[PDB]
Subunit: 334 residues, 2 copies
Amino acid sequence: MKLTGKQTWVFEHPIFVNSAGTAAGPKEKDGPLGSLFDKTYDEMHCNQKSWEMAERQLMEDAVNVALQKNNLTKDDIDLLLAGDLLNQNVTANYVARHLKIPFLCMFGACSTSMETVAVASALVDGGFAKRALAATSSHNATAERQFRYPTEYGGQKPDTATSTVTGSGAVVISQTPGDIQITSATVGKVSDLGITDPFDMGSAMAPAAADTIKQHFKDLNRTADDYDLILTGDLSGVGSPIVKDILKEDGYPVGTKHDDCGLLIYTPDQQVFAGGSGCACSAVVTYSHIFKQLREGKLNRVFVVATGALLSPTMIQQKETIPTIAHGVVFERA
Amino acid sequence: MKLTGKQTWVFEHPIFVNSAGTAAGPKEKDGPLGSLFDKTYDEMHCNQKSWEMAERQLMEDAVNVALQKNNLTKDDIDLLLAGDLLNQNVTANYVARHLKIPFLCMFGACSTSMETVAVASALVDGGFAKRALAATSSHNATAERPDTATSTVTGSGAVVISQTPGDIQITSATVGKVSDLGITDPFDMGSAMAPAAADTIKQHFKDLNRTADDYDLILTGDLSGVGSPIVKDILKEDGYPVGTKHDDCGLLIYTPDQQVFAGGSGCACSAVVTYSHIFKQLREGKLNRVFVVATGALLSPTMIQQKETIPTIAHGVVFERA
């Protein structure tokens, strides 16, 4: 079987990333990775009438640029796996309306990034799709109309807070040889240690990432030594240290091989509090900077773990806790 | 390859439904299928403090009853594929927190029913999971937050899928694509989803070189009173008449006396009707090959506020009396 261990998929047929596209907003463009994005904007509106339309334009760009690079058209794709953090997945659904590609709407909060890639890889390895397209997007303002710090009460947004990344990433997956190769994926399970504070996501998601990372090592009988980098989605300032401790306390120290996209996307000068977040966070950083590091040879085997928080206002209203999840995928220099 | 045609998956290894569980609310319990549900309630609250907790209890029931029937425990499951129509998928996420089974949150409006089952079948056939659990739920109250309107079904259905022999067998699935003819009226879903169902049904026939004659029944999710006639016309106008082999869950779940307008709707609509009544018909032999097509409308208030249209989609799965 392809299922190895408890939660890990090891693909039999070689699965590769044929092309990757990324688009990002102004704050991203001016960040330390801004020059690596395929498309950028100076205005959050992205030349659109509304925030929702902006996020859509971001995904449109990532998808088209990805298809363009591999000299492909929407008709060369068999499956489309996408999802966004805004309810009903408006972004993906409307973009899918345009692509007219058999659509499988995914959603795992800010872990959608790797969810879509993991299942897409499995469907291409299982022979259900010759070519698959996995995409995700996020917009600072759209996510703000859904949830925001109630300033009207005079309090101040805590340092534990984070800032949603404005951008989108898309990737093309198939059995056709490429520079980057997807070798395994670990599907995570829901974790809930009891966190209730909706403003400290880092500490809430840390356990989920550690769980998935730990189960992944055990499933493949591997350790941190088997990777050049263990990249986490958006644990940011608060969660990064916490995940490194839990891993160490579990006998699987990640040491200095760990890093987080939310810490790489921006610079501590762009007033982004703890660090970056959002579905687009892990996606834009991986599809541009970590794919590149891998192509250039600066890296060989990386483990990307997108983390997500499944918390709604109505639930926190009923004294419920904040469940979290983490999904991981292993990328390697072909 | 397993991919046949444009959008259809034909599984190589035999995939079966080992067990199915369903739970429903009062209006369902008193309907013409009420006696077939595993668990029912007389109060929409389902002995819970809030509507959200009620829906959760509904999914808990369906999952446990399904696991109970096949003498299984949450630890016997490798993958959990569920989704609900309320934003952020609160129901599935919290239920998943309890099952602690590797979770893949799905969402395709009222088509989630078949989406979860189709991808679950593919992951079990591809060898990524020995046992998969697909579930969906819907609650009339959480859903709200003329003669064209519909009424959300209160209930939940769950199924267990694996390569271990069972009474019902899943032989193929057709993944649908987004359709948008231009409907903008958020109160006539039947006419908005009809095209999506017709498209998926048509592509499915062409992919497998089949016709309506190859099925004893073509079941649609919740086209209801308005969409059912429309889908039959489009199919006829396309050279693929479904004739009298068509029926809709929203027309079977309730009786035109329970004041449910056009008919039933919601993720739970197609699920509870299929996992109880149509699985049973198949076990008893009253049916042999059925094609279930769950349809969904992807419309939000904020989008309709910007003069946008209503995109829809339909996913189908072929269940066969093994």
